[PDB]
Design a protein around this nucleic acid. Structure first.
Ligand SMILES: [Mg+2]
Ligand SMILES: [Mg+2]
Ligand SMILES: [Mg+2]
Ligand SMILES: [Mg+2]
Ligand SMILES: [Mg+2]
Ligand SMILES: [Mg+2]
Ligand SMILES: [Mg+2]
Lengths: 124, 216, 225, 63, 51, 109, 128
RNA sequence: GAGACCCGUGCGCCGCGCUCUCCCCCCUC
RNA sequence: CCGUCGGGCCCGGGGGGCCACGCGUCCCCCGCGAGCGCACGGGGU
RNA sequence: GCAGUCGGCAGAGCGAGAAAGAGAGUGGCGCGGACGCUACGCCGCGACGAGUAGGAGGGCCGCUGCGGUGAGCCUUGAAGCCUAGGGCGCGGGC
């Protein structure tokens, strides 16, 4: 299970960075990029990811599906959101809270949507 | 419906009233006083009529946020602090300014302001010190005094008046207020002999003259 | 529903508020009573001297039952009998203070540790300000400051010692549960004494510091506390 | 200066299993929660026995 | 919790000891009473010198 | 127009015989030769004014060579009117024996 | 203009001078890096007054400001553009530092990426 | 604090006692 | 018999402080009032 | 101490001197709510801190080489070396 996979990968993953008295996980759906049990994006049955869209505008959100856990081709469902910032945060908050879909990742995903949207707004 | 009343016991010392619990119960007469038992504005459009929400969502969240602090209780802002004045400072006393560009000069204290700063003028016809604020910890309070009981200080000479604004020129109002206070306080100065020259002089330390020995 | 559950929990809060005010009134009236106890003992001792002085006899006061002991030497060069009695007295630093109830067994221990302690018979005021300023409990083997009455009453409340004033009364009038009320107290960690010392290495009656300074420990307590 | 001996301040009792077995460590993670958040002393004895070495956990025969 | 001195903090003293409010209301009322009796007697002496 | 500070001398650091504590300075104020006379100056502000080579900015002025270590009086030192003072930076030992201005304006009177 | 931390506490350091090895001024063969003196007669080990101070754990920094830069961040070595986005969420307290062997055509890319991500760079104008 | 009949710091624990849900009178602007 | 700012919630009969202030019955004895603030009040604003 | 992040499947309690249940039944508008938790983690209280010979622990201290890994770095400049530059760490060192 997830705790077992965590007890395997907690110190021996390839996404592990241990530099400068810090620890980061370079995993694709790790919100906050933190090596943790909670924020790990591989070991759970239900994961949320947030990253920039394929084109430079928008935020794509990733939800892990329930059935094909051992089937990585159909496992993650990606949804591109190109709205204004308040609507994009409303969409992510409704996807996480109204579905009850892994609900402790709500504002990690909201803050990641905000960070990607700020990074997409250009500097003067 | 009740018009408020003052507290029915006086202050004995700070924190303790004069009368005890049952005495204050009688003085409040509680023995005959037994008792028993926002977000949405609806606005038209041109559609129909919408429920517009105020207090809308934050468009941006910072990546990290500071936690809210614990609560404290005795910590009041500067506009609510208590104002202590030294008991050697009374209206009409002579002060010695110690710090600013008018240092050593002797001035006539009038009134303490609402920020605790000392409104003062040793008159511009004597000192070149205008209506001005000073600070009590930075003035020396000598025990020579003028009775200024009959002196009308204008009500608008406040800390908002004396606050620095933002190339400085005296306004016409500040010109006429110094005259309106000088024309009153100056006949009280000149009715006691040599005090006008005393205020014209400045305070200085010389050889053998020590401040712990000199009484002012 | 929840309208009856809400008033059910508010009834519990109201009942606990009434229990707290009942305990508050109990602490008030019992400290009121202890004030009268101290004044009856003080005026009874004075009156007992006076009726003997009228008759021409002598009234000998009762030998004191409470001593406050202050360790005045260091932890260097202590002979092991003296060191053992000092750790049995819970005085393991210089200028640590403990209350000791006095009997033959305790006085003979203080007699062993005379060059290392200075002691005497504490006043009501000395007991009061020692508990109020340097009073620390020993709760769950930790040194907790006596900031609440419940902080004493959870440990000594089964001996009917429920506030600071029962604690002071139990120490002062050396009561039935003195051992528990004094072992609950951490040994007082007092400052260096303010105004200097006379002579630390000699006895008090030979013009020094050590020994039984009988009622003169209170002057020392004002300077150490 | 305090006259206390510091030879036996540190207790020499096991806080965790020395084994890096992840299955035993997940069992210890379960019974840390149980031995802390229950009133049962059985869970405490189980957790301290999960800590021990193989020699301090000798096998139990059927008979 | 920061330890406050009940010998210097009045309402820490009242939190530990509710009767200290009564004991400090008395021997302030009593002390003012004794001081005005003292000055009434000091005035009576200098008045009796004027007889 | 005239002098507004008391004259004091940096007599040394707070010290025993073989241990000097540089963070506390011993002032000798001119006119103070008893501990009873020290009560005026306790809490007053004291300044070690000195000149160096490069210019530094002067508050309410144009840059010149004078530089100040600010401080204040904390307590008296001994029976003979010597005083303990604490400065923002510890005073340089080149200033021992030299002048410290004792200002008049933490006024209490 | 610059990127600020989330909070800026005053970074109190109990010592600022480095702990010099004993007798490293008298010799070039003795490097300044610290060694505990272990000789029997050694004054520094015996802690005599007026000597070179030995490092203690009491000298250790506050845990709220340990490893904190004087700007108020904590640095993280970055070797490429991909290792910036681990600091995309730690940006208000942890800053980026491009490694010393990253070429001048990739330093430009890491700097222009961190400007988008609002990550502070300790050395933005390094090679150029 | 409201509470499944409502969704409000985003100044509250303990402990002290202030006023109002009663009615009059005196004094000062 | 005398004495005690004695002890009895200062036993009992003919100006000043009290963490005393519903009523009804039986006998003994001579559980949810409401609001408003102020603060020596769970570590600086 | 904390798996209780128990949320329109909601109701946000468990510091409080006194063994135990904020137990359950039945008769008499507006869609909101910081952080956390590498559980080998994080947090809270209290006491303490000398050290030769000696013992033990932790080293995101360091060197070399191997097995995995970093869609790592590198001729738009690696190792090495020098540096009155900027710093971090109690320190080894980086
Ligand atoms: Mg000795
Ligand atoms: Mg002294
Ligand atoms: Mg020690
Ligand atoms: Mg040891
Ligand atoms: Mg041992
Ligand atoms: Mg030797
Ligand atoms: Mg050691």
């Amino acid at each position: 299970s997830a705790h077992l996979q965590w007890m395997v990968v907690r110190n021996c993953s390839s996404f592990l960075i241990k530099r400068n008295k810090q620890t980061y996980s370079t995993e694709p759906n790790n919100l906050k990029a933190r090596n943790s049990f909670r924020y790990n994006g591989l070991i759970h049955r239900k994961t949320v990811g947030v990253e920039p869209a394929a084109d430079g505008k928008g935020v794509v959100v990733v939800m892990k599906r329930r059935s094909g856990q051992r089937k990585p081709a159909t496992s993650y469902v990606r949804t591109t959101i190109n709205k204004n910032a308040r609507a994009t945060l409303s969409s992510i908050r409704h996807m996480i809270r109204k579905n009850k879909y892994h609900p402790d990742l709500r504002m990690a995903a909201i803050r990641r949507a905000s960070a990607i949207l700020r990074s997409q707004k250009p500097v003067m | 419906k009740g018009k408020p009343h003052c507290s029915r016991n006086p202050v004995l010392v700070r924190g303790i009233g004069r009368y005890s619990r049952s005495a204050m119960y009688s003085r409040k007469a509680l023995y005959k006083r037994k008792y028993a038992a926002l977000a949405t504005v609806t606005k038209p459009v041109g559609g129909g009529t919408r429920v517009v929400k105020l207090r809308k969502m934050p468009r941006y969240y910072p990546t990290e946020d500071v936690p809210r602090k614990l609560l404290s209780h005795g910590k009041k802002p500067f506009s609510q602090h208590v104002r202590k004045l030294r008991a050697s400072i009374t209206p009409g006393t002579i002060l010695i300014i110690l710090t600013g560009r008018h240092r050593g000069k002797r001035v006539v204290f009038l009134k303490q302001l609402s920020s605790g700063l000392l409104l003062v003028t040793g008159p511009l016809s004597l000192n070149r010190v205008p209506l001005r604020r000073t600070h009590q910890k930075f003035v020396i309070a000598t025990s020579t005094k003028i009775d200024i009981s009959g002196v009308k200080i204008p009500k608008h000479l406040t800390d908002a008046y004396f606050k620095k604004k933002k190339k400085y020129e005296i306004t016409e109002q500040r010109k006429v207020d110094q005259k309106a206070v000088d024309s009153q306080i100056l006949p009280k100065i000149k009715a006691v002999p040599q005090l006008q020259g005393y205020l014209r002089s400045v305070f200085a330390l010389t050889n053998g003259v020590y401040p712990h020995k000199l009484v002012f | 529903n929840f309208a009856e559950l809400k008033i059910k929990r508010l009834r519990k809060k109201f009942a606990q508020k009434m229990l707290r005010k009942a305990r508050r009134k109990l602490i008030y009236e019992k400290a009121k009573h202890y004030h009268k106890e101290y004044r009856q003992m003080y005026r009874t001792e004075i009156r007992m001297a006076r009726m003997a002085r009228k008759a021409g006899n002598f009234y000998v006061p009762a030998e004191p039952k409470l001593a406050f002991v202050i360790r005045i030497r260091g932890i260097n060069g202590v002979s092991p009998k003296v060191r053992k009695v000092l750790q049995l007295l819970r005085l393991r630093q210089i200028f640590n203070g403990t209350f000791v109830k006095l009997n033959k067994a305790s006085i003979n221990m203080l007699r062993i540790v005379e060059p290392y302690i200075a002691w005497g018979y504490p006043n009501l005021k000395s007991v009061n300000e020692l508990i109020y300023k340097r009073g620390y409990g020993k709760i769950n083997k930790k040194r907790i400051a006596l900031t609440d009455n419940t902080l004493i009453a959870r440990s000594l409340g089964k001996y009917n010692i429920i506030c600071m004033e029962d604690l002071i009364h139990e120490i002062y009038t050396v009561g039935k549960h003195f051992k528990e009320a004094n072992n609950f107290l951490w040994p007082f960690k007092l400052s260096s004494p303010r105004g200097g010392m006379k002579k630390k290495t000699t006895h008090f009656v030979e013009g020094g510091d050590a020994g039984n300074r009988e009622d003169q420990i209170n002057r020392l307590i004002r300077r150490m506390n | 200066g305090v006259d206390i001996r510091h030879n036996k301040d540190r207790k020499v009792r096991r806080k965790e299993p020395k084994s890096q077995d992840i299955y035993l460590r997940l069992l210890v993670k379960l019974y840390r929660f149980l031995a802390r958040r229950t009133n049962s002393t059985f869970n405490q004895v189980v957790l301290k026995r999960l800590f021990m070495s193989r020699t301090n956990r000798p096998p139990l025969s059927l008979s | 919790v920061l330890k406050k001195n009940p010998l210097k903090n009045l309402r820490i003293m009242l939190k530990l000891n509710p009767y200290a409010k009564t004991m400090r209301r008395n021997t302030i009322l009593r002390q003012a009473r004794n001081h005005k009796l003292r000055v009434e007697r000091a005035a009576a002496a200098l008045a009796a010198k004027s007889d | 127009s005239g002098r507004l500070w008391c004259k004091a001398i940096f007599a040394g650091y707070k010290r025993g015989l073989r241990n000097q504590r540089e963070h506390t300075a011993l002032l000798k104020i001119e006119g103070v030769y008893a501990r009873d006379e020290t009560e005026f100056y306790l809490g007053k502000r004291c300044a070690y004014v000195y000149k160096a080579k490069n210019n530094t900015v002067t508050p309410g002025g144009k840059p010149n060579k004078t530089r100040v270590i600010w401080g204040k009086v904390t307590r008296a030192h001994g029976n003979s009117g010597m005083v303990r003072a604490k400065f923002r930076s510890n005073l340089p030992a080149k200033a021992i024996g030299h002048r410290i201005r004792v200002m008049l304006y933490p006024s209490r009177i | 203009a610059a990127l600020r931390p989330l909070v800026k506490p005053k970074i109190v350091k109990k010592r600022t001078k480095k702990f010099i090895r004993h007798q490293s001024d008298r010799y070039v063969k003795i490097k300044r890096n610290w060694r505990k003196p272990r000789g029997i007669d050694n004054r520094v080990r015996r802690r005599f007054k007026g000597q070179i101070l030995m490092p203690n754990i009491g000298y250790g920094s506050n845990k709220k400001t340990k490893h904190m830069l004087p700007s108020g961040f904590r640095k993280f070595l970055v070797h490429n553009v991909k290792e910036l986005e681990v600091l995309l969420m730690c940006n208000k307290s942890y800053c980026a530092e491009i490694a010393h062997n990253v070429s001048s055509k990739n330093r430009k890319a890491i700097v222009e990426r961190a400007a988008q991500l609002a990550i502070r760079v300790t050395n933005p104008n390094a090679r150029l």
